[PDB]
Ligand binder design. Structure first.
Ligand SMILES: O=c1[nH]c2sccc2c2cc(OCc3cccc(Br)c3)ccc12
Lengths: 195, 197
């Protein structure tokens, strides 16, 4: 388990509220304020989920072998409703769980926090609180998505089981990625914020 | 990787044809013929898929820790069409590709206790040469309950703690004949039986 995690008294799941003004909080807040500087941050939590981390790291090691390079991970954003937050913290992102799915039936992740900050995604709750994850995503080798995909396309129609790792809206200048498998995304931080 | 697998000389995938009279072949044939005595096996292949095995074994270890001393794994059957076999061999069972079952206990991947169920033409569709295809699958059934057609994940054990889930669902908890799983890497395709009438 990562060095920057804090001790969990022999437990496997903890949400740790970050200390404002320390390097870790500052780094995550800056990623958010790059595009969401008009919002108000209530708190940032580090998600320490040993099981989800384990499964994700196995997939990363496999994708690093398959792709023969270690440039397969991106840090992306995911806005969701308050009622989904406990599920994501414990189980991560589930493609089987309203919004447009124009690039395929997977879990969507934004390059810019401002996109995930839309009320359609980070739905404000009874109190006006909005919720956005900072997510480690194994985007790997990607291609343009399209409606109705249930997996990424093959890299070559001649070898139909050798797949792209993810899809995007635009390969030259991506603003969203879609992944189609359990444990290709690790929810690393939860930002609680208002407009 | 299991020590009795063939050496794949650094390759990550291969299908190994088994020999009749070996215990490994005979136990699978016996498990199949217990309910499919009218069909005849062409061949049995051991599926050696390093990446699927790694991710499955991680999930098994997690479930064994979480459930504390449950037998979490069952050996079940899955009939499918020839067009799906390359994908399953490489990538396993994808709930997003699964058909609606004639009796639906949820939107997931279905596995049968009896080979006879998987042997129905509706699952193990005969190909253009009359070959039918059935996997023998290690499935992490864990702690289960009776499913419902509307499920896209197993239900919670307790409605006041919605994130603490059953591992799988079944048609009948007293006499299970099918199980449904809703997550990737909860089922390892271990053998492929090719068979005919
Ligand atoms: O942060 C997100 N959270 C959630 S919760 C349900 C969908 C999304 C989403 C979709 C996203 O893209 C959907 C989409 C799909 C097609 C065109 C355009 Br533009 C945008 C991007 C980010 C998120």
């Amino acid at each position: 388990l990562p060095e920057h995690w804090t001790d969990m008294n022999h437990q496997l799941f903890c949400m740790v509220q970050l200390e404002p003004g320390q390097s870790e909080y500052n780094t995550i807040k800056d990623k958010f304020t790059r595009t969401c500087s008009s919002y108000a941050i209530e708190k940032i939590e580090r998600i320490q989920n040993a099981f989800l981390w384990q499964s994700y790291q196995v997939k990363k090691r496999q994708m690093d072998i398959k792709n023969d390079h270690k440039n397969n991970e991106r840090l992306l954003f995911h806005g969701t409703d308050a009622d989904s937050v406990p599920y994501v913290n414990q189980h991560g992102f589930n493609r089987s769980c309203k919004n447009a799915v124009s690039y395929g039936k997977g879990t969507y992740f934004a390059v810019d926090a401002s996109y995930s900050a839309k009320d359609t995604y980070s739905k404000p709750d009874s109190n006006g609180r909005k919720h956005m994850y900072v997510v480690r995503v194994l985007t790997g080798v990607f291609t343009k998505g399209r409606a109705g995909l249930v997996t990424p396309p093959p890299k070559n129609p001649h070898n139909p089981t050798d797949l792209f790792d993810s899809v995007t809206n635009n390969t030259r200048s991506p603003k969203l990625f879609v992944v189609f498998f359990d444990n290709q995304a690790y929810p690393e931080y939860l930002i609680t914020f208002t407009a």
